[PDB]
Design a protein around this ligand. Structure first.
Ligand SMILES: CC(C)CCOP(=O)(O)OP(=O)(O)O
Ligand SMILES: CC(C)CCOP(=O)(O)OP(=O)(O)O
Ligand SMILES: [Mg+2]
Ligand SMILES: [Mg+2]
Ligand SMILES: [Mg+2]
Ligand SMILES: [Mg+2]
Ligand SMILES: [Mg+2]
Ligand SMILES: [Mg+2]
Ligand SMILES: [Mg+2]
Lengths: 138, 138
């Protein structure tokens, strides 16, 4: 029961980002970014690339730090505290399309225009966007 | 062995920040900021205020998130991995002077001018400044 580090990735593709619905004890069915737990020894950029590859099959590059958010999940099966480091990234091959590589954790990935985001967003993401955060400018 | 979250605080005082030489198995004798481990359920701001109080006796306000750095310490007696969340702040009372509340962890605290910093900086802090990071503007 300590805070744990997650990296989440904004894959900027045109005016769109990649989101998919979680299959999870936490935030089930809400739209969230690809990402996951930072491994011991791993840089943010390597973790971003690796998690995105594991979850979506996509090859990304130009990983750049955006910000960090503190996410305490009060009403969870087990009390959870995650510190979320956000990374922006772009596709290596601009023609690539995601695949749902981990259907046990995600309903599927799709591109969503920044101006037409889906709902409900995973609540840390809703709160981050509600603050005015924009990965296309930040 | 997993990554652990720490909060470090830039206490801004005129043109100067608070630094002290570490007593520690990691970065011993290098100049570092006040800070410490984030506790479960705690916000970055609460942790910042608590750690500066525990370590320096100083009272800080106007905390603002700056950035996050990924600090892997493979050469440590026990390998360590800290994700370090930077917070800027200022003294409630600018005349208040630091006290070395944990002499077992620090040689002592002092104000150092941004333009004339001591050496050696704890290398996460030197890497951060080498990036062009400035806690007064940022
Ligand atoms: C609660 C959570 C969003 C923090 C960790 O993110 P995640 O579920 O995607 O973690 P993993 O991909 O590593 O399984
Ligand atoms: C080493 C650093 C990046 C993170 C740990 O900071 P710290 O040594 O001050 O931790 P404590 O205050 O708890 O002793
Ligand atoms: Mg563009
Ligand atoms: Mg994972
Ligand atoms: Mg994953
Ligand atoms: Mg995941
Ligand atoms: Mg300390
Ligand atoms: Mg501590
Ligand atoms: Mg401490």
């Amino acid at each position: 029961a300590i805070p744990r580090v997650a990296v989440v990735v904004f894959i900027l593709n045109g005016n769109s980002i990649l989101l998919g619905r979680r299959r999870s004890s936490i935030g089930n069915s809400t739209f969230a970014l690809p990402g996951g737990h930072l491994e011991f020894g791993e840089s943010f950029e390597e973790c971003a690339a690796r998690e995105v590859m594991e979850e979506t099959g996509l090859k990304i590059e130009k990983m750049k730090l955006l910000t960090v958010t503190n996410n305490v999940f009060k009403e969870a099966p087990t009390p959870s505290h995650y510190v979320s480091v956000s990374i922006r990234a772009v596709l290596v091959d601009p023609s690539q399309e995601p695949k749902n590589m981990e259907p046990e954790k995600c309903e599927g990935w799709d591109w969503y225009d920044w101006e037409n985001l889906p709902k409900p967003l995973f609540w840390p993401l809703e709160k981050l966007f509600g603050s005015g955060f924009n990965p296309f400018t930040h």
